[PDB]
């Protein structure tokens with residue numbers, strides 16, 4: 840079975856709008872979302888439908904760009920650091936669960952290279 844997916848809204852979580860967060864949504868997420876390698880990462884990992892039965896025995900902090908996209912669009916975050924941490928978690932899960940040189944790890948590295956490309960231009 841799959842665990843419950845990460846929340847994308849919470850009536851008890853304080854939130855802000857900042858230029859850094861606008862940048863993360865409009866530049867970083869939108870650029871990675873359209874990438875030809877984005878598709879494994881655009882929704883929570885369905886370990887049943889994808890035939891990764893051990894996935895959630897290993898990965899205890901799931902994250903994906905579909906969740907991140909909705910958190911940004913819903914204004915879930917307080918600061919840019921929280922959003923970067925979610926991206927970092929997504930990539931980490933891929934590198935931890937899969938083995939070095941796995942095709943999916945090669946995909947994640949290309950997306951991560953682009954992610955860092957855009958973060959290097961994050962505004963003040």
Ligand SMILES: CCn1c2c(c(=O)[nH]c1=O)[C@H](c1ccc(C)cc1)C1=C(CN(CC3CCN(Cc4ccc([N+](=O)[O-])cc4)CC3)C1=O)N2
Pocket residue numbers: 879880884889932933936937942943
């Ligand atoms: C980030 C999580 N994640 C992932 C995977 C993983 O390995 N590790 C992870 O962490 C898996 C993975 C993703 C990409 C690549 C290049 C290799 C493996 C993996 C995903 C998504 N998905 C969808 C399909 C599954 C069906 N198809 C074979 C296939 C084709 C056609 C037919 N038909 O025509 O009928 C039948 C069967 C291969 C891909 C995966 O396979 N996510």
Ligand code: NA
Pocket residue numbers: 857859860917918919920
């Ligand atoms: Na911020």
